[PDB]
Amino acid sequence: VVVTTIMESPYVMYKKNHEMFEGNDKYEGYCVDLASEIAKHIGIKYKIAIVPDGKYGARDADTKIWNGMVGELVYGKAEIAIAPLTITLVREEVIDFSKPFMSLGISIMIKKPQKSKPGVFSFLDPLAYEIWMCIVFAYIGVSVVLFLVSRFSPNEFGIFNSLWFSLGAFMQQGCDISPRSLSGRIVGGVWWFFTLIIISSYTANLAAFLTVERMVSPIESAEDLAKQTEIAYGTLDSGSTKEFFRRSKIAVYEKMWTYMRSAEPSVFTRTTAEGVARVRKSKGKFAFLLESTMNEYTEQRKPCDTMKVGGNLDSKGYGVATPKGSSLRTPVNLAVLKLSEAGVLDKLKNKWWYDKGECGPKDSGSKDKTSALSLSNVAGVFYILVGGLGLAMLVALIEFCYKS
Amino acid sequence: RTYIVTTILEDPYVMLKKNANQFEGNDRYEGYCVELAAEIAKHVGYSYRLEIVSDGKYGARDPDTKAWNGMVGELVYGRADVAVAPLTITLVREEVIDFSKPFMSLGISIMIKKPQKSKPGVFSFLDPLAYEIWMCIVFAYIGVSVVLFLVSRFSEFGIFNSLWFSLGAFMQQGCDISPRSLSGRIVGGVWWFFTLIIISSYTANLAAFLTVERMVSPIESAEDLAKQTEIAYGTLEAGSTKEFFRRSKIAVFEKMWTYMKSAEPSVFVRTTEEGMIRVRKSKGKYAYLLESTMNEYIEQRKPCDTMKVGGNLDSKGYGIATPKGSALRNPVNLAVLKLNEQGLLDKLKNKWWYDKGECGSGGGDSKDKTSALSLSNVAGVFYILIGGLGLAMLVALIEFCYKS
Amino acid sequence: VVVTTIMESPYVMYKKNHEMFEGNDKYEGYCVDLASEIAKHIGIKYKIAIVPDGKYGARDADTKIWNGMVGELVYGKAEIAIAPLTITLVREEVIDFSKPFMSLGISIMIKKPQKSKPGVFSFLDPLAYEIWMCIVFAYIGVSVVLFLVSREFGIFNSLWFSLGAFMQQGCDISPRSLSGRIVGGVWWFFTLIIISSYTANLAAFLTVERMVSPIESAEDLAKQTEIAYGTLDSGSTKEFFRRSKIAVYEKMWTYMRSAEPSVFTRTTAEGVARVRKSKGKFAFLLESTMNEYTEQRKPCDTMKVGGNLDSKGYGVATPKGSSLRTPVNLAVLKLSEAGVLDKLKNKWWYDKGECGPKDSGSKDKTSALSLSNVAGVFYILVGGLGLAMLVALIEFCYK
Amino acid sequence: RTYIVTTILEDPYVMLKKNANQFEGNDRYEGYCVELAAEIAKHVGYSYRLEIVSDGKYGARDPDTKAWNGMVGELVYGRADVAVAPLTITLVREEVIDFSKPFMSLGISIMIKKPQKSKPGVFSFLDPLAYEIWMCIVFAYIGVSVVLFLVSRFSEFGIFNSLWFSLGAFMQQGCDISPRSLSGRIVGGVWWFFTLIIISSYTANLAAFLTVERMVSPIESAEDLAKQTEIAYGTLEAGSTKEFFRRSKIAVFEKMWTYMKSAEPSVFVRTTEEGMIRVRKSKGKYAYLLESTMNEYIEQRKPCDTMKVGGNLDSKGYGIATPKGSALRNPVNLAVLKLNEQGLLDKLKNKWWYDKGECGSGGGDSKDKTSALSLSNVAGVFYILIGGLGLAMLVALIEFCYKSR
Amino acid sequence: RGVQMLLTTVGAFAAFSLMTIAVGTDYWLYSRGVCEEVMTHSGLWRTCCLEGNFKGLCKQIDHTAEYFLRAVRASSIFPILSVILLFMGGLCIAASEFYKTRHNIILSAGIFFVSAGLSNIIGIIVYISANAGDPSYSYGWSFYFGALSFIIAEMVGVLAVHMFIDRHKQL
Amino acid sequence: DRGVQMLLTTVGAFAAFSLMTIAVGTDYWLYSRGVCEEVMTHSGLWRTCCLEGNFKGLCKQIDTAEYFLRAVRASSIFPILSVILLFMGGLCIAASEFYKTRHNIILSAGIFFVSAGLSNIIGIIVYISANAGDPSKKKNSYSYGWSFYFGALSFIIAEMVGVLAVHMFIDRHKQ
Ligand SMILES: O=c1[nH]c2cc(C(F)(F)F)c(N3CCOCC3)cc2n(CP(=O)(O)O)c1=O
Ligand SMILES: O=c1[nH]c2cc(C(F)(F)F)c(N3CCOCC3)cc2n(CP(=O)(O)O)c1=O
Ligand SMILES: O=c1[nH]c2cc(C(F)(F)F)c(N3CCOCC3)cc2n(CP(=O)(O)O)c1=O
The missing domain is CATH 3.40.190.10 (Periplasmic binding protein-like II)
Incomplete structure (x- = not known):
């Protein structure tokens, strides 16, 4: 009885290095142990020969071999192969x-992100985006209503004085002099209430943002991956995945193939080792496409920087392959x-x-990484600082040119 | 033939x-x-x-x-x-x-209802507190306002000045007029102390609520469902699922099998459509395992409130x-x-x-989780801002009618 | 072989299908399954009987029986006692x-540990007491320093300035001395930093709501606390506590002899019913197996074992002169060695338990803040307001 | 005989x-x-x-x-x-x-080092904001102070009034120095915005740091050890403990037995004494899994850095x-x-x-478990404040010079 | 200034009527409680369930700083003293409208009335604190009359301090 | 008592010039631990070199709202504009100390000192953004070098001159 097994696959592992535990069972892995299990199940002699x-x-088919x-x-030269x-x-x-x-699957994988270090978007991340525009609109409106109350209703306050009063009203500090009227008290009170609610909500939101972290995935599906059109993609130079992509029928796959057609920086990687090295080197772009078993094997490898998004593009x-029909096929x-029916x-x-994996032992995330407010969360804060102080100096200069 | x-x-x-x-x-x-x-x-x-x-x-x-x-x-x-x-x-x-x-490929998998929470408007503004506390603080504010006015009249100032000073004291504001005498000074001090303690308590409560809202564990795969122990799960009395659960070999699936055999949630199902009905009527308090093919059929043909989560538990x-x-x-x-x-x-x-599926999950894009506010709870801030502009127009129009 | 067993609730129970079968396959638990396992180990036909x-x-000790x-x-009557x-x-x-x-011994048990709701203490539930003693000391010190270094700032104006500085507000009047500016700035900085620290600490306390273990967690803490303690009327625990020479249990014995006679209970069901009705009252000392049985029952409220004391x-009991003793x-x-x-x-x-919440912790909704955390503020508010209006009336009537 | x-x-x-x-x-x-x-x-x-x-x-x-x-x-x-x-x-x-x-009786028990930590003083003030941000905001404060003086005296209201307004603005207090021109007002407004977002961010980070520091719990029982990560533990080789672990068949016991079976680190050691000494050398993450008797003996030794936690896994x-x-x-x-x-x-x-244990005679030495900012961490602020107040007192005497010399 | 004194008189009489409706009757307890969830009601000296298993009966109910607050919240002696102090406040306001040349004691009557009001405030908030302390209660349209009692007390107080402002011009 | 004040302004400007020259000459900015492995590397704004390692002796030059700041960090345009404006301020205060009749000269001097403060803040903030903006940077970090302290001292003497010369502006305006 002869059984063949390719050593260049994530299904075998060497026992020590050489001349240790010598004999027949020199390789330990999924396929050889499955072969031993079925050989104990039915009765089959054990072999070690490997096709060269x-x-x-x-x-x-061109050479008919x-x-x-x-x-x-x-x-x-053999009858049983695993x-x-x-x-x-x-x-x-x-x-x-x-x-x-x-079951076999084909899926895309991306590099695990490290952190995000934007500019003014660092300070823009909490309290959403449109809330800034709405609160500037509210500030302008309350300034207009305050100016109307101070001027039309029965003083010594222009448009600049009114906008400064509204700005100090927005910032829970007070004022130099009260309007001293029964009309402006209620509008000032509701504006102060709104701005203090906003500030308390911002503080609570940033506290909740900083106490825990989630690391949301940039992509979640192949359709969204094709739709975003901002991350480079490369399947493989040739093989089953390339042939499947070149001769697909689902509508989004033809668009995906045309996207590979207009590929500038040589997305066709010669070897899967070069592909995984490239996707582990740069995390900004160049996400890979690969079989599910190889992705799950790389998920438990010492660099520990990879993550699949799910979804099977192709199912196969x-x-177990046997030559023709005989008494051993059935x-x-x-x-x-x-x-397969049993859980063995x-x-x-x-x-x-x-x-055999150590990377996945630390599941989810690690909570023992806090440090303090480094400049990554402060870059937006100091950028809005330098912008505000520079713009304040500029408007001070132009206002001096206007008036004094 | x-x-x-x-x-x-x-x-x-x-x-x-x-x-x-x-x-x-x-x-x-x-x-x-x-x-x-x-x-x-x-x-x-x-x-x-x-x-x-x-x-x-x-x-x-x-x-x-x-x-x-x-x-x-x-x-x-x-x-x-x-x-x-x-x-x-x-x-x-x-x-x-x-x-x-x-x-x-067939695979048994868990199915879950759609988690949908619609944040209200002005009701969500009083969500990060008790309405008794809001009633207490507002009524204590008006009480200390009239008390401060009477003690200022006992030991320049009017009803509008009293309201202005009282509310600015209520919400951490300066004032042009000074709270003369040590009695008025200590009333101002103790009431500033109260407004500081209550604003700190409100900010702390909002931070706690947002922290506990964001820090949530959605159910994925089978291990998380095994070690959450809060959502009921089960299968049919007989079939492929019962046969697979009877012959479990993995320790985590052995734990799942003995949890199912503990009969705390039992099976509670005769026809799988009845299980679908009862998991729709459970409001997310129950979960059920069935084949991926029929689970996809339910997610498409039925109205979009139930779907699948996690990978396949077995290869079939x-x-x-x-x-x-x-x-x-x-x-x-x-x-x-x-x-x-x-x-x-x-x-x-x-x-x-x-x-031919009356569902927009695969026919349209989903909602991106950008965290922070999403015009849901700050929407209530905008409705109390609507109340604020209502009070502002009310006080302005009533003042102009009084002068008229 | 014939064996007799005593109907003990955490060792043998009647099966739900009582009419399904009567005989050997009529019980489930520790004792009967251990008997079946050892009988299969040696190899013999066995029958189960109840004690008469x-x-x-x-x-x-009087009739020698x-x-x-x-x-x-x-x-x-029996040659083995499983x-x-x-x-x-x-x-x-x-x-x-x-x-x-x-292995079993005498262990403590208390009631359900729940969150308390104090009225005045909830106002300063985080931080401590010495923190606010020191903040008042610093307030008086900075007021005195600001009053003395400025010489309109009398014995009330400087106090008002410091008090306004204590709650994020400025002042209507400002001095013309840079020493006053420096001391006001550093006091403003301290007030702001301590208010931020307090608010963050309150946020953490409100977002964890973690229940801490009570004082009754050790025998030394048991002797040093004012809480009540109880035990069983007459038994192994009573016999152990009757004679002691460890110099730690004599104080406990004198505490029993000097307290009310209500600490003695007849049955363990009456004891758990008595301790279940109050969070404090009398914590009890009872068997470890009894505690492990009670902590995994339908009332999943008290599941506290505490420290382990005594050895017992x-x-399995066998008669004299039996060939199966070895x-x-x-x-x-x-x-015991291989492990079954x-x-x-x-x-x-x-x-096998009614609730599995003891294995892993679970997150619960904190719900509304209620009013216990705020009720202490209103008391000092109304007290200060009353003191203020009385002193206003006195000052305006006299001066 | x-x-x-x-x-x-x-x-x-x-x-x-x-x-x-x-x-x-x-x-x-x-x-x-x-x-x-x-x-x-x-x-x-x-x-x-x-x-x-x-x-x-x-x-x-x-x-x-x-x-x-x-x-x-x-x-x-x-x-x-x-x-x-x-x-x-x-x-x-x-x-x-x-x-x-x-x-x-006895039983195999888990062994951990005694958790000992000391809160700092003035260094505790720089926990949730590091030290670069404080320097940046202080230098920005003096910069905006001189800028405010420039715009107040260029577009009373002297350098002293400018320092008054800037110092009031840094804590959102305000001042009575209100210039007629809008330029100084908008400078004050943007500086108010900056200092308020700094205060909010500081409060948020200190809350997050306190929650993440106090949220963690000490290890106990065996299930938490089974689902524990990043902390090493194991037993010795020449002993019956390894035989008992190998002979066990309980699902949780076999679970962590398979967990340390692929012993990538040096899980197995030779002697109890050498293992104890190298735990003293490491003292950050290891457990020896010895008997309860010898653990109770060694927690009464001279270093007094070991303690008994958890319960007995068996009934030997x-x-x-x-x-x-x-x-x-x-x-x-x-x-x-x-x-x-x-x-x-x-x-x-x-x-x-x-x-007879010369060290650790009183077991109840530290059991208050004060889960709040006591006078060990925040009172360091009370140090720097009084130091600042001392600095105030120091500048007071030189201002006394400005008063009398 | 007859409008001022007639406003004070009508406000005092309205406060009398609504506070008698508030405290006299048995209407203020709505919650999800068990008396089997059926209608329950608390009171000043007794608790009664109108329907259910307690029809036709109206049962006389029973029950340092913690002891004091528990006694005030349970025995309701301090709310009794507060409403009786409201009764003397109304009587002395009647004396004030009978003695219109009373410069200082009318103001003293106002201070006593607002003191009774703040005493009622502290009583109702310790009452609802004890209500919230049961687990470890809403407006019953007559507890809403208690809220309206607070509102009418604040209203009569603000119009009173308005007419002492008018008294400043008068005196 | 204005001669001592103008002498103080002159010596402060001279100290600022000396600090600027030793900044643009030396490379003692950050005591970084990099490679030439954590070894003492003179990370420079204009010249980055090493003292240890196998490659000691040879060193070279360093290099919608982030590209501009990246180009600023690469080209060091704001430190260059800063040192040019300090040179212009030195020229204008030299004209002030030689010509007393003109008045707008000290207006220009005060504007130049304040813009020196602005440019110094921009330079130090882009420098710390370049240093602390990377999550990768590394067992030990921080521990800023001496030239950061010299730049801080240059900033302090910048407010010193910008207070005293502006006070001289105020007194000459009121007289
Ligand atoms: O029968 C086939 N079985 C294969 C099985 C595997 C895997 F199991 F994953 F190891 C792979 N790997 C793909 C990833 O890189 C390593 C090799 C290739 C296979 N190919 C070549 P293809 O035609 O390029 O797919 C076959 O032909
Ligand atoms: O040695 C003794 N060991 C005992 C052990 C147990 C148990 F907990 F079940 F293990 C009990 N149960 C206590 C609860 O009610 C049923 C009996 C009684 C025991 N008694 C009788 P005591 O004389 O009343 O203490 C002994 O004598
Ligand atoms: O009978 C036996 N009695 C033993 C008694 C003790 C102890 F009492 F603790 F001193 C110990 N210690 C274990 C810890 O390290 C020091 C020696 C070992 C024993 N062993 C060998 P094992 O195979 O290691 O159990 C036996 O065989």
């Missing part, structure tokens, strides 16, 4: 496949089905995928 | 047109399954006549005291060859017949029944895998599950 | 005991 | 006297075990003379060449009738000889070893049960574990 082709499987595990099975192998049109007609033990699965099919396959999957 | 295709009466796949009457004959059914049957008959080449199973049940091949019936029962009896219908892959229906290929597939010793086993497998890989099946799924 | 007397097992399980095994039975000095010369498979063992000893040792009594204990006393 | 008892010293049983070996021998033994041996010899009547352990260990099953060692190995291989030194209950110990009764017990068929098996069982009931064992535990 390297590729999982390909159809070189099959390369990889599927070619090694169809020409004949490896990550996709199922396609040309592979089924030559080699029958069993039921898929694991990994199956046996291995029922063995795979029985192991899921037990092995969860164990080997979560016990 | 003329071949037959048997189809189970299932809601999300095949529809018997409610009009009945005309269009009877070949086009008696419109839906996913009949379209797939027409496509496979046009591809491999035969004529199909629709049939309905007698007992109306899926059936199984359990080793009971005979009395075998169902879809596989009528397949093995002789009067059935091709069954284009949904069919879960199970070991009890594999020992006699084999399936071709899972065209789509579909299939079409084929005879053990017929010539219609391999070509149908090759053609259905061709349709699955090409994406025409994906196109039909998109057409039947995204186009 | 109901006694826990003690010597009457035993009533209960020890009385039945001594007089030849029912729980504590190890005492009197129950060794007539009966044999195995190694203790459970629960063991067999049952090695059996209970194997179950602890697994069943976790599955039954912890996993 | 004189009876020899096998005694092995770890802590604090057979510790030798501080006067070296100037005494007569066996009479120079002080501890819990030797006092219990003297009492149990006086109860029924025999000799309590100690014996020297041959191997210095406790003994193991030793599947190679069978045999036995330790105290139980000396007991089974003749020349021993009474064993006083404590030893754990194990199946291989029971399959050869039998115990009497566990005189006092001690026992005094006796040979099978001897005449000193049942009377010693009756007498040890009598002393266990009498509470004399509790008295000996109190005197040799809480009274």
